[model samples]
Target: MSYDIQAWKKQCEELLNLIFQCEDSEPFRQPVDLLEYPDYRDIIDTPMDFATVRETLEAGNYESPMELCKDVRLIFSNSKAYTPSKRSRIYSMSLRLSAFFEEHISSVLSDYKSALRFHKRN
Candidate 1:
């Protein structure tokens, strides 16, 4: 399905918000905070900060979401590189967040396909 920039952006913002909310939890306190993490300093070779994320979303850069997801996955996969105890906690939370994004993307594609079929029928 062709990308829907606006829908993707909205979902991306929602994902960001979900991550931010998770920050209050003990397991995700500091390490998983996207805006503060050193590992998230660059996403796909581009600077990644709170401003960058917000600006990218505001600018309708749909590719940013995929790149962000890639960085998130990379950070969690090499959990041993961080503190050992925190590693497991961080990895588990990251997996949950990643699954959330997967679901969001799947839902978007499904909706897009249904819209396409409806349009074709009409």
Candidate 2:
């Protein structure tokens, strides 16, 4: 499927809001039973851990919404080499989550490119 920039942007915003609203003292800490929640586990194990993302957001490192998308994309790519095997259900779930992130990031990149094109045209 082709990238849907608006939808992806909404999802990113939702995730960011979730991160902001998290009350846990250590939101990025891996749960004791990592296998129980594959999506959460994958996120925790990745370089894009919530804590780092939150800090980066709070620090205003991303000058634009698109910049945050690129950061997330980079973080996910950095974690690709460490993905779990496909032999288990949790691994399958992790793969699904990874795919979702990739698609979202791709859409964001697509939107960013479109914006650049428009700027250049103007």
Candidate 3:
């Protein structure tokens, strides 16, 4: 994976906008309130959101191209973990947002393969 780190960060940065620009992403832009989501912290080992993910990305915490979505994915699963109704608005948004991520992430991955899985780094 040559030049993987920078490439990933750039792509990860762009991917976030897809989630952010979606009006339905309002609830996921930031974390929940501890007082309101008292059960959240107890249930989720690792919490995630667009803002938090952006902070991590900007801080240069991510090391691999594939590593970026670890948190992106968490954002959705955490929705499922906390929300009770699958038919609810947030849940539906969660599902739609996940599919959105999957599609975009897939596009990013294909470019890497086409780049000949470029570079020799690990």
Candidate 4:
């Protein structure tokens, strides 16, 4: 119902861990990995690499409004081998979640930027 950044961060972290673990097992093998640092040193970094959508949103400098979309595209493209269906359901679910994140983050960033602008005007 409401945007929960903390909950989203935790859920994303759990998903990342699952993906990393799956990379080690069969049926869905891959060499991808996540990092505590922001280097994104993996051979192929997916959207799941980052801990959360908020992290990517912030790291992208918020210069592009469609960064989340771009990341989802890359992730889906890479996921072709794993889920032949192209993760249509996952994609839809992610889009919904991303929309929530986008709106909340945009509002927060807008307020922050407005505050800065006000400070500058003063």
Maximum-TM-score candidate: 3
User: Which candidate leads in lDDT?
Assistant: 3
Clashes of 3: 1
Task: Give a tens-digit lDDT track for model 1, residues 35-99.
Answer: 66766434333323333444556676545455555644544454434533644666566566556
lDDT agreement with native, every candidate: 0.52, 0.53, 0.79, 0.43
Model 3: ten consecutive residues of lowest lDDT: 113-122
Where in model 1 is the C-alpha error above 4 Å? 1-5, 24-52, 63-87, 112-122
Residue 97 deviation, candidate 3, in Å? Answer: 0.8
Q: For candidate 3, lDDT tens digit of each residue in 17-98?
A: 7778998788999988878878788988888888998888899887654667788888888999888597799899888888
Worst 10 residues of 2 by lDDT: 24-33
User: Per-residue lDDT for 99 in model 2?
Assistant: 63
Candidate 2 residue-wise lDDT, 1-122, digit = tens? 23333344455666666544544313232223446645655455444554566566676576656767665554445444444455755445445555655664665667767765766776
lDDT of 4: 0.43
Query: How many angstroms is residue 115 displaced in model 2 relative to the true structure, after the best TM-score fit?
Result: 1.5
What would the TM-scores of all predictions be?
Answer: 0.46, 0.49, 0.82, 0.37
Residues 1-122 of candidate 4 have per-residue lDDT tens digits of: 23322233344334434543542222123334444534434334443433344466545443433344455345444544333453576545434444544444455445445555666776
Q: Rank the candidates by TM-score, best first.
A: 3, 2, 1, 4
Candidate 4 wrongly placed segments (more than 4 Å)? 1-87
Candidate 1's clash total is 0
lDDT, model 3? 0.79
Steric clashes per prediction: 0, 0, 1, 0
